[model samples]
Target chain A: GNKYIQQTKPLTLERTINLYPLTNYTFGTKEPLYEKDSSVAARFQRMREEFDKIGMRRTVEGVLIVHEHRLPHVLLLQLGTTFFKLPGGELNPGEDEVEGLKRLMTEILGRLQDWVIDDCIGNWWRPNFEPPQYPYIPAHITKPKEHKKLFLVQLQEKALFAVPKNYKLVAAPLFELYDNAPGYGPIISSLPQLLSRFNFIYN
Target chain B: GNKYIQQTKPLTLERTINLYPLTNYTFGTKEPLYEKDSSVAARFQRMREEFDKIGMRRTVEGVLIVHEHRLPHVLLLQLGTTFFKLPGGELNPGEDEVEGLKRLMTEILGRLQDWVIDDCIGNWWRPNFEPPQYPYIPAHITKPKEHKKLFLVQLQEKALFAVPKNYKLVAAPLFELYDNAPGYGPIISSLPQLLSRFNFIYN
Candidate 1:
């Protein structure tokens, strides 16, 4: 049984914020809803307004949010107010997503997964515009940016092994959750509200 | 000492049309594109049409479609087609999907799962109403059905007990998969066409 397990160290990840489930994930749903019946068009208007306020840059960055069904949890990873950029450069214009993702992950994490990981779930996007407008914090809230969409991927392998030692570490930012998580499992939210679609307040 | 194990009698159940990669469990990636592509949509449509053409229905008598995430392979139980309306009549109008599916599965399978199940990975429906058209099959050049979108679900559970009695079982219905499944899993097309969107030509 001579399977060559490559030797690579995990990159040092230092997350800045604490993972709290409340303001991070559950706050949206905890708010009250009117009992009166509404039309589909009305609901659509509300969504447009809310999205208009958030704008597109933040919406795209906000898409990285993830939900873990088995644990009935949500994950909103906010990389402090530091700096972040879309991983891949102009390698192959619109090369298939998996290949591009693999390249990006390898460059960032030092090694891509043995096999390129597919979308574990569906893809969702929203813009980041204003505050007091909603719960989810958009990626490029006030800054003007190009068409960018944040993504959340469920790596098939539970743990990473090929990260380079010199890589900068980012700890899990703070999070709000229903139940307190122990030790180091990633600061994530456990509320279902994090995944719900947005509603806009129309005039 | 009265430390006892609870015992119960089993009930009668049967099935006829069984299909592969059933509901929750995962399988070897049989196709090239792990992500949803156009070719896969074609396979799904062709197979479902063939299945619809074959005279498989549960009309007028009591019948059931049992689903289990357990067992090593997907199995079909045939207990003769005598259709009857299920005991739990229509759901109360606007029932949530989870509740509805759980109710429907239990009515046929006979019990409830200890844990809640989520079909996170299932994409049974073509991304859009665009499956390829069959020029000769129905002799009318008809397009595949739109509107009724099905979903694909990952196999998540390990084991589940079945009703004590043995009803007829089939190994795998993917036999017709290579040359377009006539009456089998139409949800996802075969290995080659996983990601392509479904489109059609009306003969």
Candidate 2:
């Protein structure tokens, strides 16, 4: 059977609006999936493994760090070959979103004394048995899910930190990257819209 | 062509993290999509029509209004033919999310004097050509999009208003819906998790 072939027709607005009170619900696993592997494929595989270990559902979390001078710059992590990503990972079982992200930052950068989570930027989801894509989720586990929360983290003070052997931190001008690359366009494109003329509360 | 069949393999973490900034990017249309049709299908069709009039990408917005007693009760709208939905609509092309929702509230409930938006609950997106599923996307839309915000709206006073001819208001206990229904389960199931143990500030 094709895994992506959904047997259940998607619900309509009428049906949803007239929805019965929800009962017999099982909440998704509280922890984020984790992987200590170096390769993307390995990490993806580990996430799938971890998700299965708890329940079918998982939360993938990340923090978008931004710093501004005259113009804004965002922090990016370069990992093996040409892989670049945000510096956080899946949450630990029973972890809070902000705290989990703080842990991920510490794991990657060795410390996180000068940053605070500003607000959640936004989030999106993928169905189970979907693509084993960048933000985790393997092709095998079939269920519904969420990125849960993608936070806009503000750095309270100028600080330096260590980058693990496989990671390099680059502070890139926001516009240059968004203009030059279309691949990361979806994620970075929203930053300017989110930051434009908005006063970000730095905690 | 099956829209789901990708010409490009799904993005990997490294590729996304290394993404170049977007330029020449004309952001989405700047106005909310509105319709006053009598039926769910009519409203759904009208929303799709309005979306087509603008551009491909559209942001649907909605508000979840809660009033507290012992357990929290939410205000829901029943359109013609058992269609119940949160009271909000699509963002006006280039409209701020909060403002768009505010406009939607005024349009539906007759006034916004008694409601204050507490905070954003969260957000979710669907790919172009995906089913008109959760977050209240209509089935006919064959383009990519987002339902940018689902706000936690706090009412400042016990409110009463007229329900248009085809609409009915239901103040439902949160748990009954989450556990009993499958169709609206995904959207409502998260409410308990979000509202549990928190004091709902009822105006």
Candidate 3:
């Protein structure tokens, strides 16, 4: 039997994660949704620009998992040729974390895609204006530039996702993301280890 | 400078944890509290006995962290000379997780001691009634015997704890618990890596 092949039985730190088959979920292309910022430089420019008005930038991401070949897969949004990110966006001021995450997913996935977010997968923080976010804060710096939280978005047994035409939504296996920090960045790369604690049931 | 000596200034997969000096919190001896079962055999015996009635055993442990000489220390209860455990126990049927933890902490520590549980460090699961537990369920297993949840119990700048007279409350540094599985068991041994993601503010 393959290493990935396993007969599901029962009960993570003990989180019961129910992952449906990839075939159970359907996806289609929707009207292109453009981001507020145009370039990478503009992204940071807006981050700094928004910090003045927003204080600490609070970003929320959703982890929607599906199963294929008896393993868990994370739903990721691909851009251009290589860059990939979990579906999420910055939360507006005074918005609820869970509700804001749902809003972001509906916007990215489609307005009809109502996200049911319950569990928080984990969190990451950007200490500086540049890239590289870690699981924990490193002692030495006092202020963090941004705080991005990740939530586990539960899906119904059968659901639909209309990904934006400009963005490519793909289901990347846990094995592919494991230890691929160079490709997924530390935040997304560490998902395998972070999500490993869950007892995922594949249907 | 030592690698452990992370002179404070800066920024988990990231949580902002504030750890106070050991001296800030005072500890004294309190009335001893005994467990429901006496021996390890009796412990498992009762677990099997209770599973039939209460379903899965829900155990909660508090990770009361402190800082000493520039590193984070986990407060542990040393039983006799060889055994050490965190301050927590099994919750009554239908008891709230957080509220139950506070009750357990108050019982282990003095009633005057108040615990604030905001973050869950991680979770561990016992696949069977035996000793071995894993961060995640082994793929072959279905029904887990017990679910142990760990929470980050936040402490105040200055507080008092009256530890049980029979147990010795000791503060173990992250390095001591890092790879000492034989001494502390896997659940506690893996704590260093588990806690490494937190941006600790050592005051």
Candidate 4:
């Protein structure tokens, strides 16, 4: 359980906008093969190289976008039978967590001017004693420390969207979140337990 | 680097008293031998067993008690030639972060009724991909997930104390923190970086 009292007050709208601009979402197309040095594969390689130098791996930030009165969902990149993780990515050197998250979300879902960004929900760590589950496994070949910060974001306005065929956005029920969450990703499976500690209303 | 602005406000005293009650500090001692089922060894075994059952390991919480400035020093448990960790431990099931930290501190340093408890500095995660350097290794035989939440606590009043013979609380200069900090534990080496994000005064 968390230390603070659950938020009893309903969420107040901090701001609102019509259309959230989509940045460069080239990764949205049908799942690209990472056989060689695909961007994602390359990204993981770079992450690993960096971890090798620093002992501790880099940090990552992402959001759980919960549609109004709907289950919180994350977008996964599907390839064959494999599904990758959400819209967030590694923080640029010297980048702040929230800012990095915004940049990442923008890259994947366009501008989030219409999204109600909530406080940081929580964070989790993955030690480098053994490789993480699939997908994340590629990033830490050896001892790599992984810290992921998760945030709760509410979609204030339903905006139009066109995602690549390979993008699989899923919002599972509380009971099935763990079953459906992509391998090794942190947010979805743990949300039900974390949200229970805070006063987050599904509807 | 973190995104939040540093806390510039000086610490205010909300409570005042000396003789912080010592609940139970059995963990404190001239670093006892970890040959068999010593607490540290036993703790590691339990952690490894738990990870085997669940894909994810358990979480931990602790405090970085900085004495009144002039380069705040941290209390380290000296085990022979090794200076182990801070005065904190695993949280009871269903316990909150701050409460657990308070409980652990009280046990180690007596009642902290006069200490100025600041906001959570942040949390760090260590995945069990490989054994962490120095002190953290003996605890994990295999893979495990380690979550640690660190709080910035200021000692408003210097209370006298009698600790176990093996316990040595040394306050090192900022330049020497990393040198004195155990190789892999997050708090010691990261304090300088984290304190930069918050308004922390050395003297």
Judged by TM-score, which candidate is best? 3
State the DockQ, from 0 to 1, for candidate 1: 0.02
Candidate 4 is scored at a TM of 0.40
TM-score of 2: 0.42
Which numbered prediction scores highest in lDDT against the true structure?
A: 3
Query: On residues B1-203, what C-alpha lDDT tens digit does candidate 3 reach at each position?
Result: 65686553321123577989999988888777777889999999999999898888999999989988667889999986778999999999999988999998888885455677766667677889898776555555677899888877889998888887888888998768754778998778766655654667878
Question: In order, how many clashes per candidate?
Answer: 66, 39, 18, 25
Interface RMSD of each: 22.1, 16.7, 7.8, 14.4
lDDT of 2 by residue, A94-199 (tens): 7776777877776666532644653444443344434422222223434544354455565543455666555666655545443233445334433333332123
The number of clashing residue pairs in model 3 is 18
> Global lDDT for candidate 3?
0.77
Estimate, for each residue in B166-196, the C-alpha lDDT of model 1 and write its tens digit: 2333333222221243443332112112111
Best of the two (1, 4) by DockQ: 4
Residue B175 shift from truth in candidate 4, angstroms: 1.4
Ordered by lDDT, highest first, the candidates read 3, 2, 4, 1
Off by over 4 Å in 4: A1-203, B1-43, B52-61, B65-70, B111-118, B133-144, B178-186, B201-203
What is the DockQ for all candidates, taken in turn?
Answer: 0.02, 0.03, 0.07, 0.03
Candidate 1, true inter-chain contacts retained? 0.00
Worst 10 residues of 2 chain A by lDDT: A12-21
lDDT of 1: 0.28
- Quote the positional error of residue A158 for candidate 4 in Å: 12
- Tell me which of candidates 1 and 3 scores higher on DockQ: 3
